[PDB]
Amino acid sequence: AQNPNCNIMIFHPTKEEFNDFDKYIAYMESQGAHRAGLAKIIPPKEWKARETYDNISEILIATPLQQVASGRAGVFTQYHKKKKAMTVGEYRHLANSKKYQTPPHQNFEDLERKYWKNRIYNSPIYGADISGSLFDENTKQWNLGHLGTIQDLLEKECGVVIEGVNTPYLYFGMWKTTFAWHTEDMDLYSINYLHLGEPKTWYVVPPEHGQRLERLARELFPGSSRGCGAFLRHKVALISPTVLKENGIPFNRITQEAGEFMVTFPYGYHAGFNHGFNCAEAINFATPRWIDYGKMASQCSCGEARVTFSMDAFVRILQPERYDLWKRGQD
Numbered sequence: 001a002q003n004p005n006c007n008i009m010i011f012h013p014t015k016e017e018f019n020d021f022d023k024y025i026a027y028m029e030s031q032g033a034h035r036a037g038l039a040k041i042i043p044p045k046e047w048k049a050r051e052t053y054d055n056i057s058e059i060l061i062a063t064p065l066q067q068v069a070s071g072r073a074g075v076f077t078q079y080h081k082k083k084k085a086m087t088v089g090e091y092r093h094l095a096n097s098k099k100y101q102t103p104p105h106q107n108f109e110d111l112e113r114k115y116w117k118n119r120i121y122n123s124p125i126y127g128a129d130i131s132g133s134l135f136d137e138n139t140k141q142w143n144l145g146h147l148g149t150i151q152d153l154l155e156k157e158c159g160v161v162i163e164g165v166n167t168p169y170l171y172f173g174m175w176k177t178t179f180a181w182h183t184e185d186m187d188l189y190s191i192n193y194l195h196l197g198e199p200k201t202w203y204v205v206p207p208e209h210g211q212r213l214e215r216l217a218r219e220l221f222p223g224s225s226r227g228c229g230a231f232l233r234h235k236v237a238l239i240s241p242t243v244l245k246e247n248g249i250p251f252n253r254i255t256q257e258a259g260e261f262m263v264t265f266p267y268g269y270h271a272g273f274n275h276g277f278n279c280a281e282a283i284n285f286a287t288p289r290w291i292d293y294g295k296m297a298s299q300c301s302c303g304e305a306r307v308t309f310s311m312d313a314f315v316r317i318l319q320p321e322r323y324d325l326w327k328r329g330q331d
């Protein structure tokens with residue numbers, strides 16, 4: 001078995017290898033990359049997502065989210081308080097202000113220490129989940145707005161045609177903005193490109209060990225666990241690496257820099273934080289190997305997780321027994 005310790009793998013495709021996205025994903029999996037839950041892909045040196053980022057400041061962040069924490073420094077939840085709209089230029093200036101900017105630090109490890117020590121005492125503002133793309137239409141390789149759609153994959157594998165669309169999302173971050181522990185909707189893959197700015201640190205649990213993380217989360221968030229049988233679908237819980245190590249949960253960590261792709265694999269729980277002002281683009285995707293994970297994906301039916309239009313069909317076709325109750329949650 002390839003990559004039996006489930007280490008995060010880093011790939012350096014050539015420009016020729018960068019042509020066929022599906023083929024490269026399948027290659028990475030042939031080498032065991034999925035066992036980690038997460039892989040990094042460094043694009044060939046010839047490639048670019050677009051010519052410059054000089055003209056992005058007038059993008060609107062219609063609903064910036066203030067991420068307010070509750071709990072202890074290594075075990076907390078976050079809720080999102082909606083703020084008034086602002087442009088990307090306004091948000092950048094905010095991120096760089098004395099109240100929100102990255103503190104002085106020695107290196108990524110020192111910054112990571114400061115994040116876990118101090119995150120809960122601040123409420124950074126995240127421009128998350130903004131439909132759109134920063135890839136130039138002329139970028140033909142690994143263009144996250146031109147990928148094969150999940151509905152087309154389901155149709156090719158299973159023969160059933162379904163409604164729904166699959167488009168990318170932009171994320172504008174600042175120091176301490178945080179993504180809570182989660183897998184993707186329907187335990188899909190994700191791909192994330194860091195277009196510009198400061199790094200993003202990731203933590204990930206190997207898919208084969210995801211249930212160990214779930215069991216710890218039920219112990220650490222006991223009221224949330226009684227409320228919902230899949231409360232990590234709410235995307236609000238944080239657990240630090242120190243706490244994970246204390247409880248024997250297998251995980252790995254890596255820092256993504258501008259110009260790099262990350263791929264998350266089906267049922268790879270991940271969480272992380274931004275180092276400073278940045279912009280990422282991400283989308284879900286599927287492969288033939290996903291289908292069996294999609295059929296088994298947990299679901300939130302308490303009603304909190306409330307998700308896209310296109311997830312309906314995935315539940316309806318892959319999880320017909322659950323359908324009924326899940327749609328009661330969504331309505």
Ligand SMILES: O=C(O)CNC(=O)C(=O)O
Pocket residue numbers: 171178179190191192200264270280282283
């Ligand atoms: O970058 C972020 O805030 C969150 N991204 C992801 O969870 C992803 O790409 O799967």
Ligand SMILES: [Mg+2]
Pocket residue numbers: 055056057058059
């Ligand atoms: Mg603009």
Ligand code: NI
Pocket residue numbers: 182183184190264270
């Ligand atoms: Ni994700």
Ligand SMILES: [Zn+2]
Pocket residue numbers: 227228229230231233234300301302303304305
């Ligand atoms: Zn729920």
